Amino acid sequence: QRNEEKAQREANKKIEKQLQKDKQVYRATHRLLLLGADNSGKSTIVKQMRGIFETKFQVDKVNFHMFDVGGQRDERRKWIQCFNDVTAIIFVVDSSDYNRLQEALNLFKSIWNNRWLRTISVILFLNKQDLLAEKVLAGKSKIEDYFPEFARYTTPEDATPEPGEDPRVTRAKYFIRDEFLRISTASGDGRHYCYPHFTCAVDTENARRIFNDCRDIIQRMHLRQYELL
Amino acid sequence: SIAQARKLVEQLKMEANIDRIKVSKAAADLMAYCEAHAKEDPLLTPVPASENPFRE
Amino acid sequence: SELDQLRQEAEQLKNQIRDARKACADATLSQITNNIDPVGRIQMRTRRTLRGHLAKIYAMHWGTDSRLLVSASQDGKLIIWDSYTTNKVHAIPLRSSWVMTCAYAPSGNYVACGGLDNICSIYNLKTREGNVRVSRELAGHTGYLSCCRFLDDNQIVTSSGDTTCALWDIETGQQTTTFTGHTGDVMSLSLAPDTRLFVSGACDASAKLWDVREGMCRQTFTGHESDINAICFFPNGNAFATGSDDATCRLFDLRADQELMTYSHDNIICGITSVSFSKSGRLLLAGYDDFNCNVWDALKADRAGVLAGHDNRVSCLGVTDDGMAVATGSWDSFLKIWN
Amino acid sequence: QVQLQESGGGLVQPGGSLRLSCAASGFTFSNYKMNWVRQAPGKGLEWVSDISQSGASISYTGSVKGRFTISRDNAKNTLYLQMNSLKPEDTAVYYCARCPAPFTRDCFDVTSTTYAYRGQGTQVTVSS
Amino acid sequence: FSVRILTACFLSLLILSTLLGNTLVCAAVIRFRHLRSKVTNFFVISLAVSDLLVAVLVMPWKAVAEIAGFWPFGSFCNIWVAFDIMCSTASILNLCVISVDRYWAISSPFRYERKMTPKAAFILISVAWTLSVLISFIPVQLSWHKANCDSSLSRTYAISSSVISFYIPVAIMIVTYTRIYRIAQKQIRRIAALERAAVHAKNCFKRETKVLKTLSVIMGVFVCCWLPFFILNCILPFCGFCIDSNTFDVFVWFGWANSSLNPIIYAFNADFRKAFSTL
Ligand SMILES: CC(C)CCC[C@@H](C)[C@H]1CC[C@H]2[C@@H]3CC=C4C[C@@H](O)CC[C@]4(C)[C@H]3CC[C@]12C
Ligand SMILES: Oc1ccc([C@H]2CNCCc3c2cc(O)c(O)c3Cl)cc1
Ligand SMILES: Oc1ccc([C@H]2CNCCc3c2cc(O)c(O)c3Cl)cc1
């Protein structure tokens, strides 16, 4: 029955041909994992990218697809380990609500120190900055009540505030960014880095930010590969 | 909750009525099963390469 | 309050169960098996290497013929390999690329897959057109599917991330039976050789035994220190081994309601991903996160050998129905056969 | 069987001092990161305290910063949390929550619905 | 004599080290199929094969000639000359390709992933080896390199072959590594800014040195091994101030010792280090 073995041989050849055809597309597409608590703006972000598990968008002939898991339960312990090969984790944080910020920092620390996710960079989107602006301008909710260190924090000199921005708002937002980078840098160890970004719900240039951040991630991965960095 | 507590209570009460055997009995059963199939396990007793499908 | 009384009664029942378990613990199986001869050093070598997957692998299952196999990777493909000649018989694309499980029907007529899509997809291998196509899509779970196994061509038992198991009839598409009682995510299940019962391990460090026909949790085992990732029946059918994240394997008996063996070493500090017995049940092959595989003597608790062929964590492992060879699939997108 | 039992707490005037002791049985207490989680009435569970395997790294919630002290004894297998100068908004049900995996600085125990490795909870109430 | 035995021992250690290193690099790929999967390993293997050929073909015969003091192989030497310039130019050119390859992997990463299929790597390797053969075997058999067989290279051939086989690789490598240094320094500036912000928040150069050390060693080993040889190979045919034959032999020995040194630099990646340790 050598004819059967030959038939299986061309079946195998066709299967490998189709597999290579799919492999080219798979290597040509970039996975992304979108994560963040509810009422953070992830739905607004994916809508701007144009509640759904999957989103696809193309920038400069580069194809990204974002995965947002909503159907799974609240526990994130074991269904996140399947995202160890994604290009980046887009972590969305609602900066306007100080009550649940500590949960966001704990989740970011858990992702950062994860044994299977130590190689995955995190792109941090501090959404809803305008609401934080009215919150700090009103003076009804003080950050010192939730974060005492803010009473003794000074705004960094490498800050680029918008024209007309209240420096109190700049100090608050950069204090949040400083907490997140403090969590990130403790065990950064050169493998993965965090990319903070300051965004609002009305922004239309978000897709470019992830593109630039992924370019930086791939450049730094290649640099670490050749032992330069 | 109360419903979950009642379900756990009834499940534990129903499970507590299961009759268990001595550890030595399970030990003897495992010994008999392992000795009854020791000669037929290719991983335990290495088979000749002539009858091994993965050797060429 | 009635809740406090129920909690106190449950604690009393747990104490009674512990006392009854300690009463039957007259001795340990280590003393009984200290008189048997060691199996000797077992050094297996990679006889076949199965390459072609694009991403990490999560599952595999050898069929009754001990010839064909299934494998799932995060590229959204199900590849049916011929173990003897390393040929590929089918390459089934998947609508959802995040699958975690596979099953091979005893008749060889169907394959199963499932994952984060919350859907159990059944594909018919035997088609009249020559091309494999999906047959049924089972929906109703609110959590990710972790493992699924066929009883026959008409009954499939599935384990989901919503802490529930479900016995489905493929034709009608309905949950014929629902198994509930687990608090944490249930990660793996195995069916008994007579298919009368099946055990499942969860993230609450507990395993539960279920009757397929009635859906009643007959018995429950605890003892693990962390999440359970693997489970498989002893070939006899009266015992099973479980792997956990605390770097320990534990062998329990169905009738004894107690823990029989604990397999651990001081130089291994990573969890166990897959556990399976050999044909005679003497060798227990376990996969570890430290990129290696270890074979335990299921009778003397001593390691009989290491399979260090993978450069990444091993996620799936399996033995034939004839006990002839063992396949290991790891996150490097390769399968390796050992004999 | 994993069993984390916490004790202490109850009704007390504001500004008092309370000690919470968590009893861990059935596992290796030294190899596990431990956390203290409280659930405010009408609000979800929130992280309140942390302690590492060796006690080298200690963290607190910003709100309870400077008022809560956590102590861990591996030999006795008991976790302590001492609270002083309580505020009227500090009343909640406190759970002794263990981090999921050994030899890891990672925790996902702030979950609300179900978590296996938590105790029943000790109620502490502050009022005039 | 003492000098003869010492030179014999030095040459024996040089050739044995070259064989050991390049055969180990080749075996790491022959035995392990995961290394050959990546595109850059194609260029690394091509360079390793070029260095192994350099060693096994060129070194033993010139070593025997040096020890005996005269060429004992008669008319073989002409062919051997064609076996030198072809094998050496394949060593220098491949490095160039590797360098430019790295540049793209650092400079245009997405286009590098989409555009460098293994076909492109095969085309680059084929171009390198085709240049190596067509600059060496064609002129040698047609007697364009001749102005014991110790024949001074003709003025035209020496300048032309030197220009191509060195000054195109060295210029390309210098431009590539300057661009890579600029990119790496920009990235290090960004990382240092973020790290300084984090440190200042906690309170309330070395990475640049590492980049400089790596680039300096990678460029400097190659330059110190090759450049003196090529400047002398350009000057001496033009006006034979001048140097003797022993100095020329020393510099060609440095040129071929670069082939021995290349495995340590270009082939001691993290993936390769495990492979050599296992073997
Ligand atoms: C011309 C004669 C003297 C020597 C020619 C040998 C050249 C063509 C050989 C030497 C080693 C060969 C390489 C050896 C290994 C590989 C990896 C393989 O996956 C792709 C081909 C590739 C990269 C070969 C390319 C061609 C190659 C470079
Ligand atoms: O492939 C090769 C062939 C030959 C040589 C050497 C040989 N040893 C004597 C010195 C010498 C050489 C070449 C010259 O062209 C020359 O003018 C001089 Cl003086 C090197 C590499
Ligand atoms: O008389 C002779 C002198 C030297 C040589 C070799 C020396 N060995 C290095 C390789 C090499 C040579 C010549 C080139 O012109 C060239 O471009 C290269 Cl790369 C040959 C004949």
Numbering used by the authors:
A (entry chain A): 12 to 61, 206 to 254, 265 to 394
B (entry chain D): 8 to 63
C (entry chain B): 2 to 340
D (entry chain E): 1 to 128
E (entry chain F): 20 to 166, 185 to 241, 264 to 299, 306 to 344
Tell me what the authors wrote about this structure, in their words.
Dopamine acts on five distinct G protein-coupled dopamine receptors (DRs) expressed on the plasma membrane to initiate downstream cellular signaling and fulfill its biological function. Among the DRs, D1-like receptors (D1R and D5R) primarily signal through the stimulatory G protein subunit (Gαs) and stimulate cyclic AMP (cAMP) production, whereas D2-like receptors (D2R, D3R, and D4R) engage the inhibitory G protein subunit (Gαi/o) and inhibit cAMP production. Here, using the same expression and purification strategy, we determined three cryo-EM structures of the activated D1R-min-Gs-Nb35 complex bound to a catechol agonist, fenoldopam; the complex bound to a non-catechol agonist, tavapadon; and the complex simultaneously bound to a PAM LY3154207, and endogenous dopamine, at a global resolution of 3.2, 3.3, and 3.0 Å, respectively.
Unassigned EM density spanning from OBP to EBP was observed after modeling all protein components in the cryo-EM map of the fenoldopam-bound complex. Surprisingly, two fenoldopam molecules could be unambiguously modeled into the density. One molecule is located in the OBP and the other in the EBP, and they interact with each other through π–π interaction between the phenol groups. The fenoldopam in the OBP engages in similar interactions as dopamine, including salt bridge interactions between D1033.32 (Ballesteros–Weinstein numbering) and the amine group, hydrogen bond interactions between the double hydroxyl groups of catechol and S1985.42 and N2926.55, as well as hydrophobic contacts involving the catechol ring and surrounding hydrophobic residues such as F2886.51 and F2896.52. The other fenoldopam resides in the EBP pocket, with the benzazepine group located at the extracellular vestibule and the phenol group facing toward the OBP. The amino group of the benzazepine forms strong polar interactions with K812.61 and D3147.36. Moreover, the two hydroxyl groups of the catechol moiety engage in hydrogen bond interactions with the main chain carbonyl group of S188ECL2 and the side chain hydroxyl group of S189ECL2. This fenoldopam molecule is further stabilized by hydrophobic interactions among the phenol group, W993.28, V3177.39, and the aliphatic part of K812.61 and a hydrogen bond interaction between the hydroxyl group of the phenol and D1033.32. As expected, mutation of residues involved in binding fenoldopam in the OBP such as S1985.42, N2926.55, F2886.51, F2896.52, W3217.43, and L190ECL2 significantly impaired the potency of fenoldopam, and the D103V mutation led to a complete loss in fenoldopam potency.
